[PDB]
Amino acid sequence: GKLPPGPSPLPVLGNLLQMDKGLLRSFLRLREKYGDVFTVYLGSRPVVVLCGTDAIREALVDQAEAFSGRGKIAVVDPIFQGYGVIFANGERWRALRRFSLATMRDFMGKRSVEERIQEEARCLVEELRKSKGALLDNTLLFHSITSNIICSIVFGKRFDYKDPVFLRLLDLFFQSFSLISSFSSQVFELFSGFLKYFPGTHRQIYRNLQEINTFIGQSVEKHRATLDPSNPRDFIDVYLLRMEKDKSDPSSEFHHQNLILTVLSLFFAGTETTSTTLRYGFLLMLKYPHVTERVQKEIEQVIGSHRPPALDDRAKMPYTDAVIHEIQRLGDLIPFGVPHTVTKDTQFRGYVIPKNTEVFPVLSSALHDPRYFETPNTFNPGHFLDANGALKRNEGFMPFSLGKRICLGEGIARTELFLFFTTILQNFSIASPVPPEDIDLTPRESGVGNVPPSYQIRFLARH
Ligand code: HEM
Ligand SMILES: OC[C@H]1O[C@H](O[C@H]2[C@H](O)[C@@H](O)[C@H](OCCCCCC3CCCCC3)O[C@@H]2CO)[C@H](O)[C@@H](O)[C@@H]1O
Ligand SMILES: CCOC(=O)C1=C(COCCN)NC(C)=C(C(=O)OC)[C@H]1c1ccccc1Cl
Ligand SMILES: CCOC(=O)C1=C(COCCN)NC(C)=C(C(=O)OC)[C@H]1c1ccccc1Cl
Numbered sequence: 001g002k003l004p005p006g007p008s009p010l011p012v013l014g015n016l017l018q019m020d021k022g023l024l025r026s027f028l029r030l031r032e033k034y035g036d037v038f039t040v041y042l043g044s045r046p047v048v049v050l051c052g053t054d055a056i057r058e059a060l061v062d063q064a065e066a067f068s069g070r071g072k073i074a075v076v077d078p079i080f081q082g083y084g085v086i087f088a089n090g091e092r093w094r095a096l097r098r099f100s101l102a103t104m105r106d107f108m109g110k111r112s113v114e115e116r117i118q119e120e121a122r123c124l125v126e127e128l129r130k131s132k133g134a135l136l137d138n139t140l141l142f143h144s145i146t147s148n149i150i151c152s153i154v155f156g157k158r159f160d161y162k163d164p165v166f167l168r169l170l171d172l173f174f175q176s177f178s179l180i181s182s183f184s185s186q187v188f189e190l191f192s193g194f195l196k197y198f199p200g201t202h203r204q205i206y207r208n209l210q211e212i213n214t215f216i217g218q219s220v221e222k223h224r225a226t227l228d229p230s231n232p233r234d235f236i237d238v239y240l241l242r243m244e245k246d247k248s249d250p251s252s253e254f255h256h257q258n259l260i261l262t263v264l265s266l267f268f269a270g271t272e273t274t275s276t277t278l279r280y281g282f283l284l285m286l287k288y289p290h291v292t293e294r295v296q297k298e299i300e301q302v303i304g305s306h307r308p309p310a311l312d313d314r315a316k317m318p319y320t321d322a323v324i325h326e327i328q329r330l331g332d333l334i335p336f337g338v339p340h341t342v343t344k345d346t347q348f349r350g351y352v353i354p355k356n357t358e359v360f361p362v363l364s365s366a367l368h369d370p371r372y373f374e375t376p377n378t379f380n381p382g383h384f385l386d387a388n389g390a391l392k393r394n395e396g397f398m399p400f401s402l403g404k405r406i407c408l409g410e411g412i413a414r415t416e417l418f419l420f421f422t423t424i425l426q427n428f429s430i431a432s433p434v435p436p437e438d439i440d441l442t443p444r445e446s447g448v449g450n451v452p453p454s455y456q457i458r459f460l461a462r463h
Contacts, residue, residue: 002352004048006030006039014041016190022446024335027051027362037349043190047339047358051365053372053396056337059348060361060403066346068093068404071339071358074192075185075202079209083258084265085408086338092253096262099242099254100408104153108232114311116152117415120145121423122308127161128428128459135433135456138282142275143174149416150270154263155219156234169215176208177272181447209264216263220256236263272449273333274413278420280452281327284379285425286432287439291381292425295320299426305463309422311415317422318391322384324417325391328399330379330441335364335450337401363398372396379441428459 007030009015019026019040027049030038036055039046050056059067070082070089080087085096107113124145141161147170148158159166179185184201196202223236232238239259246252285292302316303309314321340359345352353359368376372394373383386392400407407413432439433456444453 002354003046003357004037004039004349004351004353005034006041006049007034009041012044014043014045016042024362024364024446027336028365031365037351045358047360048353050359050361053366053369053398055349056361056363056366056398057395057402059359060340060401060405063346063348064403066342066344066348067340067359069341069343069356069359070405071341073180073189073339075180075188075205076209078196078202078206079213080261080265083261084268085262086265086269087261089341090343092258095253096258097408099239103235103238104412107153108238109156109234113149113153113412114415114419116158117149117412117419118308118310118423120148120152120158121419123148123158123161124420125423125427128424129461131459133458133460135458137454137456138279139454142278143170143271145420146271146275146278146416147173147267149412150267152234154235154266156223156237169212172208173212173267174272176205177449179205179208181445181449181451186447212267213260213264216260220259220263235266269407270409270412274416276333276449276451277328277331277413277417280331280333281324281417281421282430282457283439283441283452283455284327284330286430286434286455286457287436287441288379289436291323291379292430295323295422296425296429299422303422303426305426309419309426311418313422314418318385318389319381320422321391321418322381324414324421325384325393325397326379326381327417329367329373329383329397331450331452332364332367332399333450334399334401334448335362335446336448337361337363338405340405361401363401366396366398369396424459427462429462431458431460432456 007015007018010017030040030049031051036050036052038049040049041047050059070087070093082088082092085093085100088096104113124141127141144159144161152158179201182201185205188195188200188202220236223233224240227237227240229241232241236259239254243254243256243259246254298317298319299309303313337360340361341356342353342359344355346355370376373396374380384391384393400410400413439455440453442453443450445451
């Protein structure tokens, strides 16, 4: 009728009995029948699925405001309750977002995000030197360094990598991601009005997250008791000042609740995905030693062996830059996008999408678009190099998404990827027990997060 066309749904279950192995391949078969915009019933509610670069741009870019709503994730909603950037809607979201930009684009205290990442990179190198070339799983370290960048921005400090209190909270935090992406939580996302009365992963997510909130909560009180309003140290200080100022407005959103959850929001948006992109990139660098060998020769040409890599070096390193883009593209770590909603009844391609309908923008269908990518299932830095060896970007490259919800941390993310990759490869070459030809790139869990398989790697200190 009005909604976009899609397969006919059963009553309670919607189109689930007809869905899968992987949702991505179902969406992909459904696109083959119904085209680039279609309706699927994942449970009783309808979801509009945007496939292809085009549909996604028309929605999120041309009718941006309409498509700037955030879809609820019920597994973590009883913790978040729509606080924090990545979870907020309407005026709360606008204000939280403008404030974060007005804030994190101002690094109150004196040291920049870039300098902090360079410092984390130095600490990483020294720590990896201690391994002496022994086989390791880099999961823990890569979680630790990206957490550390958020800790630095929000709490004004980093943690040592063997800090066992930090590691205990870190284990809890990232276990909450393994759990949110489990079947038991998928089923929960569909039947939460019922299963919330039973035992399950949701009770474990809740407890793990509330335990982290407790420590965030204690850090806020410590910041307040130690505050110098003339020299804010970090995000929390700046936010505490803004609470006072707006103290006389009860339409103001700048309260204690919003602060704990926004902080936990930033860890949640800012760590796992970046960490996993790093872990994926090093899997590709083992798989293709010639690429890693060329990135090293670019590092030596432009940077040298001595001084630390800096962000201005990127513009002079189009090859390494193209390798990073291509790790993000092939890596495809958020394949279905993060769910949106429409904020009003919305006309779109002759269809009507009623307010608050959920919408999935399937970024994967853009990252693999054969219009923009000659060989989409194969690792190829060439995708982002022109005939003169300079970097090119095209409209298929939308790993951070688009429009009003575009990744708030994009520039930080790319700085992390750039400085972590080059400062590591400047100092270490790499070797694994599995030869390149036997290395498998196929995601071990292809859900909302597309996880690379576990592997072991050596970091061999250079010259
Ligand atoms: C490789 C790393 C990252 C990738 C690929 C990534 C990608 C994304 C994507 C796809 C979204 C969804 C946008 C949408 O709703 O359409 C997102 C949202 C977001 N990202 Fe990132 N992100 C990354 C790292 C970060 C970092 C380092 C931060 C900084 C803390 C960050 C902060 C956020 C925030 C706050 C949102 C929610 C924005 C909103 O709803 O307004 N992300 N990110
Ligand atoms: O007696 C004082 C104790 O406190 C010290 O450190 C604090 C630090 O000062 C304090 O900054 C820290 O709080 C961190 C709170 C939030 C943790 C956030 C994230 C960490 C990892 C990824 C997501 C969660 O917790 C530690 C303990 O609560 C140390 O933890 C202990 O060595 C010591 O015993
Ligand atoms: C078969 C289940 O897929 C869904 O319908 C989802 C949905 C379904 O909710 C539909 C709400 N109208 N929501 C979420 C949150 C998803 C997710 O795993 O985040 C935890 C996705 C999702 C869940 C499991 C596996 C893949 C995806 Cl994309
Ligand atoms: C909507 C809040 O969820 C997030 O913020 C998440 C994010 C937020 O950070 C993403 C990058 N900005 N990252 C990851 C990894 C998620 C995940 O489930 O991994 C298991 C997701 C997530 C991504 C897509 C769909 C559902 C979820 Cl729970």
